[PDB]
């Protein structure tokens with residue numbers, strides 16, 4: 001029994017984390033095969049950051065301008081190039097700890113584990129969701145740029161996120177491992193802001209199913225609804241619209257608990273319209289939306305990695 | 306910025322997880338140097354789970370009754386011994402992945418990471434706290450026995466918990482790595498129940514200090530309180546008593562924010578009285594008690 005926000009075991013990724021220094025800026029890099037990946041803004045001075053030309057800033061740097069430390073051992077950079085917003089440093093040694101891996105770009109609402117890192121030394125691991133507004137509610141301090149986010153599907157690590165910056169509201173923005181930003185952000189010090197966020201509806205429903213499996217059932221009721229009716233209510237409370245593909249995805253959980261999705265939507269509608277009436281669900285007083293359906297299935301069936 | 310329930314990176318513990326089998330029972334073991342540690346109730350049988358005599362069950366076992374599998378490899382057991390409620394299997398291979406480590410028994414309110422495992426392979430990592438009633442509010446399925454809880458301050462892994470059982474309320478109970486149970490529980494299936502649980506007051510205060518550090522002040526007030534008056538109010542909300550030790554511990558967070566510890570106790574009293582009135586603190590609509598003063602300092606600026 002029990003239900004916790006749970007990250008993937010991070011050991012496969014810890015073995016890929018290295019320290020990258022260019023001048024007075026130290027941050028984190030990801031070392032896979034013979035390439036170190038890191039944010040391209042590592043090459044900027046604070047004055048470059050206002051309006052950088054990254055192609056030009058890079059040509060002046062030689063290979064020995066990039067100091068890479070894997071633990072307490074130095075790596076030799078033999079080449080350097082840029083892909084979108086990530087810098088790729090070719091090194092003379094393949095990482096013998098390179099796990100089986102892929103680079104994947106995730107969709108808003110999907111979750112992943114972040115390995116927070118400083119000076120190439122992993123310091124913490126936590127679960128995040130890619131928000132509908134393409135930010136993530138992370139926990140980062142200066143020196144954390146280049147920390148990465150990932151899932152483990154079977155034995156393959158799927159890398160999906162690399163941290164670049166913090167927005168004024170304290171949420172965080174970054175890229176996939178091919179350097180494309182999530183959301184309408186750029187890697188430069190100008191005025192940027194998170195858009196108004198919304199709640200991930202399919203994830204809230206998944207978490208209600210998890211609550212039921214753990215014996216938390218007070219919110220269930222006799223009613224059911226329709227997609228049209230519910231989606232009107234969802235729009236009213238700044239929830240993402242529920243689609244037929246979401247209902248199919250929650251299909252397994254509906255069969256296991258005997259609560260149809262629109263049966264549970266009637267529960268969620270009543271909670272949105274009336275509150276929780278002093279009660280909690282899985283120890284939360286607010287509706288939790290950073291557990292996907294797959295997360296609930298995996299934690300409630302024990303799929304080890 | 307940001308504040309998350311953060312666990313420790315689990316790699317150093319992943320490299321120590323093995324599978325222990327005895328009879329039809331399989332659970333997890335912890336492989337440090339040439340010893341594998343696992344819950345002694347792996348040697349129990351079906352009809353003998355209310356009142357096992359572990360000394361009698363153990364003396365009938367030979368080393369080859371224990372099947373220990375590290376990854377795809379079979380480890381050879383060359384000795385065994387029981388220490389309180391943990392079984393210590395001597396093996397013929399020292400674990401090449403053994404980190405710098407120690408064993409530490411923790412007190413209620415302390416936090417640690419749990420590496421949940423099944424059949425010797427890690428499933429996930431999450432953060433926990435030892436409740437005042439000596440249980441932990443974990444996420445464990447059948448076969449998770451032998452999963453461990455730990456901290457990794459500096460480069461040294463401090464092992465503080467090994468999972469043994471689930472109580473009827475769905476909370477979990479276990480031992481330190483010396484095999485001594487946390488709280489009044491025993492490794493028997495006799496009727497056992499956890500004491501009424503209470504909120505860890507010093508931790509809530511730490512977390513309120515965290516909210517201020519990250520820029521939120523809405524819950525402060527112009528008031529203060531004596532320590533005894535605070536405890537008289539807080540006990541009525543099932544909160545743990547706050548001690549002078551706790552006040553001393555919050556000293557640093559107090560100095561960093563400018564808010565005296567007893568001034569923050571006054572803010573907590575008001576929050577208990579008023580609720581949140583639709584607002585949230587660090588993302589929660591409830592008061593959070595699984596961040597220690599030490600946690601807040603490591604995570605915040």
Ligand SMILES: O=C(NCc1ccc2c(c1)CCO2)c1ccccc1
Nearest residue numbers: 346349354469470471472492493494
């Ligand atoms: O903790 C559970 N089993 C482990 C266990 C605990 C005590 C004990 C033995 C085994 C043998 C000797 O005494 C559990 C409890 C509720 C539901 C499912 C599992």
Ligand code: NA
Nearest residue numbers: 221223263266
């Ligand atoms: Na219903």
